Amino acid sequence: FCGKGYHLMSFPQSAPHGVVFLHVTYVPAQEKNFTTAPAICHDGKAHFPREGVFVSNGTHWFVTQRNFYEPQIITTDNTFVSGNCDVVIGIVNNTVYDPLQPELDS
């Protein structure tokens, strides 16, 4: 409706008997392949991303936002737990880091 791509903002310009809209949009570029999974199996529990998606660069699993590649460590702060690992088709095994663990470790 407001240009090709993900619309950010627009500018109106007057024209003789008309209007010209300059649509400023965000276009994704330089995409890269990653190996993905619906959920992460850890401690007999299924972990799902709160807002992102699980990706793998070949050896390590990360969670990233869907529209830009920004890999982050899969923790309990960016994932939520629902059910065990027996129901979700395609769940993979990976560790889930806990930020609270070094606090009581020290």
Binding site: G5, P28, E31, A39, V53, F80, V88
Partner: protein
């Protein structure tokens, strides 16, 4: 072919030019309408040869290789169910090319979700895409993943009911 009639008709001026111009404008407007509706992608996307979409069946909407027209069963049913100086101009886009445009749109929305509409087509598994759509309407991803077989069965049943309803309603 009457010369006297044309000589008398010339007394009325450029009425004929106005009518021809209006009809020409309508005729080009129809082609513009078809371009606006169907030609929204500049890439002709194709489905993978293996139709492994996590239980989701799209055979009733994807083009049939057995048919020479390369139409879907639903599109084939739709085409079957629709039946002195005058000329009929052919449309600029033929039916097979319009079907090809719809096939490209279907392949893009199945293999890439909404990414192809906003830029380059980014591949994503179809259950994950469905989970994204579930999150769009405010339902968590887990609900989709846990009940994936049920959701796929419901979708296939609904698509079959659509074909039956179109074939059974005049």
């Amino acid at each position: 072919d009457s010369t006297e009639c044309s000589n008398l008709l010339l007394q009325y001026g450029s009425f004929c030019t106005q009518l021809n111009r209006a009809l020409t404008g309508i005729a080009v407007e129809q082609d513009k309408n078809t371009q606006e509706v169907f030609a929204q992608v500049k890439q002709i996307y194709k489905t993978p040869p293996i139709k492994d979409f996590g239980g989701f069946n799209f055979s009733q909407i994807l083009p049939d290789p057995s048919k020479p027209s390369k139409r879907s069963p639903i599109e084939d049913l739709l085409f079957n169910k629709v039946t002195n100086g005058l000329t009929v101009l052919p449309p600029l886009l033929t039916d097979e090319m319009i079907a090809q445009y719809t096939s490209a749109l279907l392949a893009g929305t199945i293999t890439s979700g909404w990414t192809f509409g906003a830029g380059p087509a980014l591949q994503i598994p179809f259950p994950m895409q469905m989970a994204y759509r579930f999150n769009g309407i405010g339902v968590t991803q887990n609900v989709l993943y846990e009940n994936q077989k049920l959701i796929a069965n419901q979708f296939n049943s609904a698509i079959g009911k659509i074909q039956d309803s179109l074939s059974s309603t005049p």
